[PDB]
């Protein structure tokens, strides 16, 4: 649930 928001993404 987050393809445009992206929950993670190299934190």
Swiss-Prot record:
Positions bearing the site annotation: Susceptible to oxidation: 11
Residues flagged as site, Implicated in free radical propagation: 9
UniProt-reported outcome of changing residue 11 to V: No free radical production. No hippocampal neuron toxicity
Protein name (Swiss-Prot/TrEMBL): P3(40)
Organism: Homo sapiens
């Amino acid at each position: 649930g987050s393809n445009k928001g992206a929950i993670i993404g190299l934190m």
